[PDB]
Subunit: 116 residues, 4 copies
């Protein structure tokens, strides 16, 4: 119940996720930023038996039927329930690059998701 | 099956992955370190229509039938094919923590996966 | 003028800094968290001719005359001036470890400093 | 003078460092990549009374007499002495950006410094 729902981050991107009983995360991500259009598939895992926040992570490869940014983002963080449910994350966005440019292929950031 | 196969990181953990034609990564991760025992389910996404490196990412929630570390790792990187194929990643390991310890809930590192 | 002053982060830690004309940052950091007591020396660099925020970074080795945590934090971010002056950062906290534990030696986080 | 010396990262950038008895790191960084030309001033801190690795960090603001990248890199890691001495780091490169591009202002990577 907790994780499953629609969330939004500070950028206004939309994350629709279903937490399966087997610890699977599935849904779609609708981004507000970058070189994206439409929704993108997400897949992740979460601690289906947490103790403390619930650790989770998910990945989006920024490719759908419309665009390809040749990049993928991974969000690693934790779900914290209560009145105000939130997912606090740190993310890595890696772009496919030639060997010469790989040193600067990864962006790091942080996103806070609020459940709607 | 560039990405599909068995890879090993510097630690000697085993990453068995199947890359779907659609951009899905699925498989098992057998760690050689941390508070784990057994194999863990992984899920990810990758650029199924790359340009030079192939962007990808995956998550492992550190819970199996045997144990629960109440944490999850996300790996973000790129697969580089050729004679000596590699997956160069950066990872984020977030532990489920109280709100008091949330500031130090996430570890960052890098992993190089090879087929040897 | 901008950078020089007293700042505080979300944890209530105190950062007292002087920006030199040569791009030098010097001051002391008074932490609210970890295994710290008293002030610690900080040293950093900043873009003394910015265009956009002003890029900067500083390091604190968590050792003073009272305690030693055998760890150092680096904050990398940017100063943004105006009504509400702020320093938005991402940080790395590395602990000295044996070779066996080096894989999990680095914490990553984010701090927002408000000028007082 | 374990740390004091000249080191090179995988890219071939040169790090000339002097470690003060007090925990200060001072020196010059000559990059072999990015938007730079010449040497850059670096400042950092390190654990002057280590336990097994020696925690340290430093910053370089990418501004010299010749150019200004309006960015700064912070390296956080540990020095490991012995026959084949190394400085294993993770770094954060933040560019001064508008508020609109701040979410993607920071790159993350890893550098291994050796004396060869
Ligand atoms: C516009 C589109 C979504 C496809 C796009 C997104 C992108 N990184 N996005 C993000 C990255 C990290 C955290 C959040 C987002 C976020 O979107 O909430 C990079 C290129 C790109 O084209
Ligand atoms: C032992 C067990 C697997 C459960 C476990 C693993 C763990 N992160 N491991 C890793 C993290 C980053 C990169 C590689 C691995 C790797 O293992 O290859 C953290 C806590 C923990 O308990
Ligand atoms: C208590 C003392 C400060 C010495 C201490 C601090 C510490 N990391 N601190 C931080 C780390 C990253 C960002 C901010 C802080 C911050 O303090 O604002 C780790 C061990 C420790 O003992
Ligand atoms: C070329 C010039 C030096 C100015 C420059 C450098 C730069 N980051 N470099 C690095 C970053 C991380 C680790 C090593 C280096 C290294 O150079 O060894 C980013 C933009 C830029 O313009």
């Amino acid at each position: 119940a907790g994780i499953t729902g629609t969330w939004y981050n500070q950028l206004g991107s939309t994350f629709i996720v279903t937490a399966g009983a087997d610890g699977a995360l599935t849904g779609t991500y609708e981004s507000a930023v970058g070189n994206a259009e439409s929704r993108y598939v997400l897949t992740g895992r979460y601690d289906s038996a947490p103790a403390s926040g619930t650790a989770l992570g998910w990945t989006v490869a920024w490719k759908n039927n419309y665009r390809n940014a040749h990049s993928a983002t991974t969000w690693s963080g934790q779900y914290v329930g209560g009145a105000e449910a939130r997912i606090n994350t740190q993310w890595l966005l890696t772009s496919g690059t030639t060997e010469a440019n790989a040193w600067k292929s990864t962006l790091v950031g942080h996103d806070t998701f609020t459940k709607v």
